[PDB]
Amino acid sequence: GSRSTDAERLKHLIVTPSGAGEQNMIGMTPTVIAVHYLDETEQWEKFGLEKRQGALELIKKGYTQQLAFRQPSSAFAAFVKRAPSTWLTAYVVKVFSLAVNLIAIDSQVLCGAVKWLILEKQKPDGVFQEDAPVIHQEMIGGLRNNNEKDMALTAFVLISLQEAKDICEEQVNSLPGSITKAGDFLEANYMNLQRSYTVAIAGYALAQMGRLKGPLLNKFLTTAKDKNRWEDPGKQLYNVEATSYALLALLQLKDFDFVPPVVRWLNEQRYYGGGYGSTQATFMVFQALAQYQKDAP
């Protein structure tokens, strides 16, 4: 293991959630992930055990406010009368799934959104489509890029369904089949991918269902630059996000031989999240480092 990221660098992540359906999740993200990370790396004592209760209170508040944007269909959008966003609904699932350890979360809200994604937004070939893009395009990170969108978004939604599986197993009968279909799609097109970002996110999605192996795994590993990062020419934030997805993949594969350089690069970026357009980078880097702190020998 490597040294934990110092808790003091994270104090600005405890934020009050405000705004409508999208903005509320933008505010909820940092606080949920900060608490998640600090819990895993056990830094509350040497940082303010009582601050944690305040943070839990803000999470509670985000969760509650987000429910005001839950539409009759179980999907989410910035406003209740705006067409539901496939990405936002999947993102809500992703966040609430990680928060099941922190506050009370309604299974029917979570699985209702999972069920809706499967039943309404998945094509017969496994692809997940977005029919109503979110207003806040800066909050979806590297998925903002137009190339390999079907792959990138399908990997993203599949990741959310996989992280909700434990919670939704018993109540969403179609879940297992949907995960398989989306996997089939990622697998059949993985070798043709050109962007490091997609390689990394589809990589993690395939690794969770043990389908990242053989030539696909070789593609995933050789895409890395200097064996420590997944990057593309564009904003550095997408590279921090991509490398984090890649790290989660590696942890899923238990390839602890390749892990050290990647964690080192991430740590050397001194990226502590927060701010405009930092949602995916903030959530992902810390989910990745927390998983690392929890898994790595």
Instruction: Note the residues at the interface with other proteins (CB under 8 A).
Output: 39, 42, 44-45, 49-50, 52-53, 56, 100-105, 107-108, 166-167, 170-171
How far is residue 97's CA from residue 119's CA, in Å, rounded to a whole number?
20
Of the two residues 105 and 132, which places its CB atom closer to other proteins in the complex? 105
CB of 66 to other proteins, least distance (A): 16
Q: Which residues contact 219 (CB under 8 A, 6 or more apart)?
A: 190, 191, 193, 199
How far is residue 167's CA from residue 108's CA, in Å, rounded to a whole number?
10
Q: What share of the chain is helix, strand, coil (3-state, %, to 5)?
A: 65, 0, 35
Of the two residues 44 and 258, which places its CB atom closer to other proteins in the complex? 44
Of the two residues 8 and 170, which places its CB atom closer to other proteins in the complex? 170
In Å, what is the CA distance from 275 to each residue of 35, 185, 187, 253?
17, 34, 35, 32
Q: Which residues pair with 76 in a beta bridge?
A: 70
CB of 44 to other proteins, least distance (A): 6
CB of 104 to other proteins, least distance (A): 5
Of the two residues 104 and 222, which places its CB atom closer to other proteins in the complex? 104
- Tell me how far apart the terminal alpha carbons of the chain are, to the nearest angstrom: 6
Tokens encoding 259: 């892990």
CB of 169 to other proteins, least distance (A): 9
CB of 107 to other proteins, least distance (A): 7
CB of 40 to other proteins, least distance (A): 9
How far is residue 242's CA from residue 198's CA, in Å, rounded to a whole number?
8
CB of 56 to other proteins, least distance (A): 7
Residue whose tokens read 């089939």:
184
Of the two residues 42 and 131, which places its CB atom closer to other proteins in the complex? 42
Of the two residues 111 and 246, which places its CB atom closer to other proteins in the complex? 111
Tokens encoding 294: 């929890």
Residue whose tokens read 């590297």:
142
Of the two residues 167 and 175, which places its CB atom closer to other proteins in the complex? 167
CB distance 277 to 237 below 8 Å: yes
CB of 43 to other proteins, least distance (A): 10
Q: Which long-range contacts (CB under 8 A, 24 or more apart) does 11-18 make?
A: 12/272, 12/274, 13/272, 13/273, 13/274, 13/282, 14/51, 14/54, 14/55, 14/58, 15/58, 15/274, 16/58, 16/61, 17/58, 17/61, 17/62, 17/65
Of the two residues 57 and 125, which places its CB atom closer to other proteins in the complex? 57
